[PDB]
Amino acid sequence: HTLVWGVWVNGVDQGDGRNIYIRSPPNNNPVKNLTSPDMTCNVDNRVVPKSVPVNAGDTLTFEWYHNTRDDDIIASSHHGPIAVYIAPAASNGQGNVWVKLFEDAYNVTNSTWAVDRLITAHGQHSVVVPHVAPGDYLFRAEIIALHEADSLYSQNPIRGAQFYISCAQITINSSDDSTPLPAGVPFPGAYTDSTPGIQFNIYTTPATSYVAPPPSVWSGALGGSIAQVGDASLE
Numbered sequence: 431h432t433l434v435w436g437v438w439v440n441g442v443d444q445g446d447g448r449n450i451y452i453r454s455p456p457n458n459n460p461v462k463n464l465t466s467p468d469m470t471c472n473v474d475n476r477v478v479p480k481s482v483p484v485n486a487g488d489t490l491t492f493e494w495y496h497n498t499r500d501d502d503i504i505a506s507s508h509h510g511p512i513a514v515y516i517a518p519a520a521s522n523g524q525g526n527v528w529v530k531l532f533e534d535a536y537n538v539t540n541s542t543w544a545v546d547r548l549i550t551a552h553g554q555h556s557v558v559v560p561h562v563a564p565g566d567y568l569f570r571a572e573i574i575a576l577h578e579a580d581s582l583y584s585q586n587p588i589r590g591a592q593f594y595i596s597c598a599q600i601t602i603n604s605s606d607d608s609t610p611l612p613a614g615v616p617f618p619g620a621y622t623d624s625t626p627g628i629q630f631n632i633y634t635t636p637a638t639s640y641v642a643p644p645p646s647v648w649s650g651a652l653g654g655s656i657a658q659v660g661d662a663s664l665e
């Protein structure tokens with residue numbers, strides 16, 4: 431159970447984004463239904479009144495939290511991968527529009543899942559803004575908690591992969607549009623019960639054998655990292 435507080439740009443806090451530039455749901459409950467419109471931008475998908483200005487080559491940092499800012503971030507049990515997608519705002523996230531900018535699942539060296547490193551980073555993970563057409567965008571940050579993903583939600587609705595999904599309204603101002611955004615995948619639709627990484631047993635299968643759900647990260651991406659860029663406690 432986790433939510434996005436706001437974003438940083440180039441290590442500068444853009445301020446509390448909840449229901450402002452983040453299309454925030456009312457609480458930190460997971461989405462589990464792979465076919466639900468809730469897979470796009472969670473359960474209260476609507477235009478919020480601000481969009482964060484960035485330029486191509488900027489570092490955009492999502493900051494997650496559990497109950498209060500810079501707390502335990504997400505329960506340690508919620509081992510799983512982290513992805514970031516982008517689509518143009520005109521889509522409202524509908525159709526084949528979502529392009530993957532970032533993927534992190536399991537790090538064999540440190541023996542840590544993306545989620546484990548997200549807690550250590552005080553909820554912060556980043557992408558570098560790509561050289562797409564200037565205009566308005568949705569950045570969709572997605573945590574998949576796998577602690578009940580040995581079951582499929584479609585078969586047993588009290589278990590399944592847990593999706594923590596947050597859409598940020600981002601406006602790209604300065605960009606040469608030298609890496610125009612290629613075709614996207616749909617959410618809902620890209621993840622199905624047979625998709626690699628949706629049904630997995632983290633208790634019996636080695637984490638080194640985990641494969642995250644496609645699509646692969648776009649070659650145009652510059653992303654990006656799970657790492658603290660700013661200290662929330664200084665504000």
Ligand SMILES: *[C@@H]1O[C@H](CO)[C@@H](O)[C@H](O)[C@H]1NC(C)=O
Pocket residue numbers: 463464465466467587
């Ligand atoms: C999952 O979402 C689909 C599409 O909205 C819906 O028809 C179905 O009833 C949902 N399943 C549950 C258990 O709510």
Ligand SMILES: [Cu+2]
Pocket residue numbers: 431432460505508
């Ligand atoms: Cu939870």
